[PDB]
Design a protein around this ligand. Structure first.
Ligand code: FMN
Ligand code: FMN
Lengths: 208, 209
């Protein structure tokens, strides 16, 4: 329609090419405000957001991710590939894994962020995280370190130590709450070039 | 003064609606918006069932209450409207096969929620319906008891149901096979002026530059 909100929602696409220009603190605040205005089952708001503008840290996550993908699935990705498409800001979304509604809740929250970015003249792409890099240390790493003790110096042994260190490092740097999972981030920036064409939607609908 | 920003920031769950049905074009716009959401791997692993038949909605509402009574001592009065008398309910379902699907479905649900506001409408997500397909959860029951007139609730002994709500609604809502059904969305014309925005809390941390 000629309703501006409807047109953004219907024309949204993922942005994977950004300028080098950082978004303003006011735009960040606005995105956060929008995010935390989402509804949530029982108003628990069982979520957290980490605002990241450290390109070194983002580059490290990108490198570990691509490396893990190469080593586990044996696909070759171009070494110039950027997990976060060079976005100047990324919002890491985490949630309480003991709330039954929480995965849905953070999708709604992510939708608010996505639409708000569009309304500010910005663009985004959601970015899936490798669970193994962000799991809390108590979810499988402890018995890993234990077993490694009786496997003195093997390769599988060195990678268990790195996993633990990586998991500890990323959860601390991002200030992930205890018991929270980090399934994805949202890369946010100023799109470089024209926007991709609107999706031709598919109506996966029944009626009564 | 961006209108889209002010809508997202002022959104509330609406639970009182006029008796006027929304137009087919509104219904279609809500769907178009829903189906424009991002999706992990572009699976778009979702489905919507549009229900405007008040007879069916009553039976769903009743069966949800019966289902609650099966697993606990709480007898909720069948006059209670689970969907707050909304004239349209959108039942959201999805393929558990896709790892990204629960998040996709949240985003789809957000798009619907915001689009409804944009159209002069309002909405409430109704999670209690999942108890028709999966074992009724204790927290859901307490979530619902919290909002009932005390006249609407009594403690009574459990009553076993004659039939399977899961099969019954998987057929009447034409839910694709194996799809999970986490909630319905009640949509309608709000009865009365819009409430104020609520206090927003920032559950946030920051890193560098
Ligand atoms: C996944 C989900 C399930 C919900 N289930 C219900 C429900 O069964 N009934 C209801 O009245 N509200 C339900 N809500 C609405 C919430 O109670 C509401 O979003 C929250 O209390 C905050 O109020 P607000 O939406 O006005 O900001 C649900 C919300 C979500 C996101
Ligand atoms: C949970 C989720 C995870 C996603 N992860 C990625 C990702 O890691 N990389 C990426 O390029 N796009 C990612 N996307 C974007 C989807 O690929 C995109 O929504 C889909 O391909 C359809 O494209 P469109 O959003 O431009 O309409 C993700 C989307 C969601 C909802």
């Amino acid at each position: 329609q000629d309703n501006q909100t409807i047109n953004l929602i219907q024309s949204r696409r993922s942005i994977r090419k950004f300028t080098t220009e950082q978004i303003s603190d006011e735009q960040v605040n606005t995105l956060l405000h929008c995010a935390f205005a989402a509804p949530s089952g029982c108003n628990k708001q069982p979520w957290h957001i980490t605002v990241v503008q450290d390109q070194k840290l983002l580059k490290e996550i990108s490198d570990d991710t691509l490396s893990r993908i190469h080593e586990v699935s044996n696909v070759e990705i171009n070494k110039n590939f950027k997990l976060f498409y060079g976005a100047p800001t990324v919002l890491f979304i985490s949630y309480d894994e003991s709330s039954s509604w929480a995965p849905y809740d953070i999708g709604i929250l992510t939708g608010n962020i996505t639409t708000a970015a569009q309304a500010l003249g910005l663009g985004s792409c959601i970015i899936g995280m490798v669970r193994g890099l962000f799991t809390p240390v108590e979810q499988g790493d402890i018995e890993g370190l234990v077993s490694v003790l009786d496997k003195e110096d093997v390769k599988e042994s060195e990678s268990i130590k790195m996993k633990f260190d990586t998991n500890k490092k990323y959860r601390e740097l991002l200030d992930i709450p205890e018991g929270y999972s980090v399934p994805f981030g949202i890369a946010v920036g100023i799109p470089d070039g024209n926007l991709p064409n609107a999706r031709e939607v598919v109506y996966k609908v029944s009626r009564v």
